[PDB]
């Protein structure tokens, strides 16, 4: 089924890579890693959560707190509030770039099970998922 | 058993001896004792070592026994819980050497005047330290070092006036800190670390809202949902979020977090 | 054209408050302060300049609560692999933060809404 070095679950190939990159560089890395490759996608309620969980936790072994996953904020804006608390539509915004948290990673605490959004620029290790080659 | 009550359940052998006005450790105690209740007795003196014949003793309870001295000799290797609360110990017994598995240390409501360097030196697995209702005024720098896995710390109701700037230093699992009802007037710059204190009790203290109380002013605005108030009630123990409880000049008046800071840089 | 203690600009009545509270409490207040008001809503650069003045009373570096709240959950998410899901299963999964302006250089900061800060209220009559 899955290529040497990858663990399998539900007819899928998963793999944790200890190579710190930004959310962007990680997805591409996964993409070029295997056909149909992408950052792991986690079915909110399933053994998959646990699976990808142990898969990292029992290997990421480190001082790292996050692991990039495939989910990301899809809106183009820096923040997702189209209107102000007064209804007036947001046009002129002035957000401090390194404050926009539009990419999701797995939190260390609890076992790399809960998700969190971070400043995509951040270099963290990741987990790729791909269908059996 | 002629004196104490025994009961077997799961991995533990529970033997009760409490409320028996015993003056010494009863004889012929079950060999596989897992937890020992010597609570509410007369034991004005007790000798740890006198328990070595009990290799499976994880929890020893001596709470409420008018204990003036604790014999720290011999060695128990599986004991993690020790309750020495409500007794009359003048000084903290150095359990580092005889008590290694010890995870919870309870010597609240005793007559401790201060704590020695290397007080807990040797207490590695320890995760809970309660020192409430004692007479402490200031603590030894680098105290909780041997206890890095520490989860609960209650220095509640004492006489603390200052706090070792880097006291909570290196603690990465502290979920509960109890410092309510003391004589503190200011917190040391960067005293909380970049930790995340789910629960912290700071009410009942005489804070001095001048210019040094801003590191504590901010923190209070940064963790208002972590500021809790402790309150007993004959049949009700509560903990309620209330950052407004922390206030320079106790009672109910001016919350520290509101202190304008005028006249300060 | 604005009651005392406040101010005026482009037909609006702004007012800075040195009271400390989290985003949701700031809005609440702002509203109760004068029918038809909320947190300051910077619509133009020159506007962010006037609010910059009603400040002065706070430490340099600080920020104030402003019109935008919970800016990560209001988002639309997606998986690089196309995996669809149901927004219902995603309960407050993104950080709960609000936006705050820093007078010093008028640059916005998306930070935890829970935190206690000062804020400016505006409205038009």
């Amino acid at each position: 089924d899955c290529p040497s070095g990858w663990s399998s679950y539900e007819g899928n190939c998963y793999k944790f890579f200890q190579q710190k990159m930004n959310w962007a560089d990680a997805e591409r890395f996964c993409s070029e890693q295997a056909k149909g490759g992408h950052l792991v996608s986690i079915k909110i309620y399933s053994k998959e959560k646990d699976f990808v969980g142990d898969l990292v936790t029992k290997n990421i072994q480190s001082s790292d707190l996050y692991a990039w996953i495939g989910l990301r904020v899809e809106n183009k804006e820096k923040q997702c509030s189209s209107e102000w608390s007064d209804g007036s539509s947001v046009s002129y915004e002035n957000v401090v770039e390194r404050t926009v948290k539009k990419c999701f990673a797995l939190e260390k605490d609890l076992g790399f099970v809960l998700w969190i959004n971070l400043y995509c620029a951040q270099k963290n290790p990741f987990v790729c998922k791909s269908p059996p080659p | 058993h002629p004196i104490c009550e025994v009961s077997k359940v799961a991995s533990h052998l529970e033997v009760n001896c409490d409320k028996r006005q015993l003056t010494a450790l009863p004889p012929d105690l079950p060999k596989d004792t897992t937890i020992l209740h010597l609570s509410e007795n007369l034991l004005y003196t007790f000798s740890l070592a006198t328990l070595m014949p009990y290799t499976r003793l994880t929890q020893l309870n001596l709470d409420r026994c008018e204990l003036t001295k604790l014999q720290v000799d011999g060695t128990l290797p599986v004991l993690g819980t020790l309750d020495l609360s409500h007794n009359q110990l003048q000084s903290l017994p150095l359990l580092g050497q005889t008590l290694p598995a010890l995870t919870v240390l309870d010597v609240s409501f005793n007559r401790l005047t201060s704590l020695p360097l290397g007080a807990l030196r040797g207490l590695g697995e320890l995760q809970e330290l309660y020192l409430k209702g004692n007479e402490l005024k200031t603590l030894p720098p680098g105290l909780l070092t041997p206890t890095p896995k520490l989860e609960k710390l209650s220095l509640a109701n004492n006489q603390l006036t200052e706090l070792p700037a880097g006291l909570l230093n290196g603690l990465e699992n502290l979920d509960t800190l109890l410092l309510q009802e003391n004589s503190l007037y200011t917190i040391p710059k960067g005293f909380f670390g970049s930790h995340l204190l789910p629960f912290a009790f700071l009410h009942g203290n005489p804070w001095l809202c001048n210019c040094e109380i801003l590191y504590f002013r901010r923190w209070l605005q940064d963790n208002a949902e972590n500021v809790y108030v402790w309150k007993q009630g004959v049949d009700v123990k509560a903990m309620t979020s209330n950052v407004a409880s922390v206030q320079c000049d106790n009672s109910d008046k001016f919350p520290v977090y509101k202190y304008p800071g005028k006249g300060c840089p | 054209d604005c009651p005392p203690d406040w101010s005026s600009y482009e037909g609006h009545c702004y007012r800075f408050f040195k009271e400390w509270m989290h985003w949701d409490d700031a809005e609440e207040f702002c509203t109760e302060q004068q029918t038809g008001a909320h947190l300051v809503s910077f619509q133009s650069k020159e506007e962010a300049d006037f609010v910059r003045s009603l400040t002065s009373e706070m430490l340099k570096g600080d920020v104030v609560w402003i019109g935008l709240s919970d800016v990560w959950n209001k988002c639309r998410f997606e998986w690089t692999d196309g995996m669809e899901f149901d927004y219902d299963d995603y309960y407050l999964i993104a950080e709960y933060e609000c936006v705050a302006s820093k007078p010093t250089n008028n640059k916005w900061w998306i930070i935890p809404c829970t935190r206690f800060k000062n804020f400016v209220c505006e409205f038009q009559a």
């Binding site: - | 799961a10 123990k237 209330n242 | 709960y96």
Partner: protein, 207 residues
Amino acid sequence: DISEPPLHDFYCSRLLDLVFLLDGSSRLSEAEFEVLKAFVVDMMERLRISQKWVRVAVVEYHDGSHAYIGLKDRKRPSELRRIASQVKYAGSQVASTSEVLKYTLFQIFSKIDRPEASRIALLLMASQEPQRMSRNFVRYVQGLKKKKVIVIPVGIGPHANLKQIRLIEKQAPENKAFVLSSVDELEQQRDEIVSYLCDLAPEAPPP
């Protein structure tokens, strides 16, 4: 001996630590809060309660969490059942579930020292905290899950936080939910819940 015999043919005799979490918001009238407490006494009445069997606990929550009964309190069932009936009505504007869980996660179950026994937190909900307090709700239910703590929510009324009830039920298998319409429907469903709770616990290895 403290002893005391079983009141009904249903007398749960298993290894279990059950934490009763009582919604204490004005979402329930002083009069309904009673119906609820009665439910808890009712539930208790059907459990073999002792440190070496079923261990009860009773926390009533609004802003903070009030504990009238601790898991380790060695007291007579009749007594624990007495304290049970005396839980003071609070009726707060807001009663937070994330809070009582935080309290349940860090306080009630900080030490799983009785591993041989099942742990359950009965969460009786009849209101819905503001969305600005649920920022860590899932962290808790997952944390409580890390500790093998099953969470069984019981929603009472058109005000109960159904969103959270359904998530809890989804966090884990055992986490079943009971949605009801009024404090009345409780004694009507007492048996199903308690039979469901008791049956989630292990039997004594001896007996």
